Structure formats: C-alpha cells, structure tokens
Amino acid sequence: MVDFAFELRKAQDTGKIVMGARKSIQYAKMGGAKLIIVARNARPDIAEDIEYYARLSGIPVYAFEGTSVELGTLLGRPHTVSALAVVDPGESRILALG
Secondary structure (H helix, E strand, O other), X not given: OOXXXXXXXXXXXXXXXXXXXXXXXXXXXXXXXXXXXXXXXOOHHHHHHHHHHHXXXXXXXXXXOOOHHHHHHHOOOOOOOOEEEEEEOOOOOHHHHO
C-alpha cells in the first residue's frame, strides 16, 4: 500500500511536480504529466477539464480524499493547491496510485 504523503513529498524532492490547476491542465493537454492529483473540492469545471484532457492522453487521475488546504500543506505550501501534476516521480512510488 502506497503512503500518499510520503511518496508525494518524495516525488516533490527527487523528481518534478508542477502545482495548480493551470499547469496541471497544460501538462495534461500536452502529454507531459504521468499522473494528475486533484483535491476533493477542486472547482468542478477544473476537475472536469483535467479529467477530459487526462482521458485524451491516457494519463491517470488520482482523487485525493482531502481538501485543497490539506493538499497544499502536504506540498509544504501556506496556500491551497486544488490540483498538481507529477511530471517525473523521481525515486518515489507515487505513480503506483495509478
């Protein structure tokens, strides 16, 4: 079983993650993310856009069971994060969530 918070942080530290709806959609759109993570309270249209662009490319989407406040904190930020994209997992097992 995958340790979300550990592996998310491990991927943030040893790989490449981009944060926020805009960059998530962008990396989804262009085929450059290997995984998209979305907080439970992402704006419904932003969540549906991600889902859409993700399904176009066959990129898995993971629904973080938690708010954008919790997700932002997990990524070490003092502000909300409604979505993020794992471009490079580094040494982490985060892509196993897919």
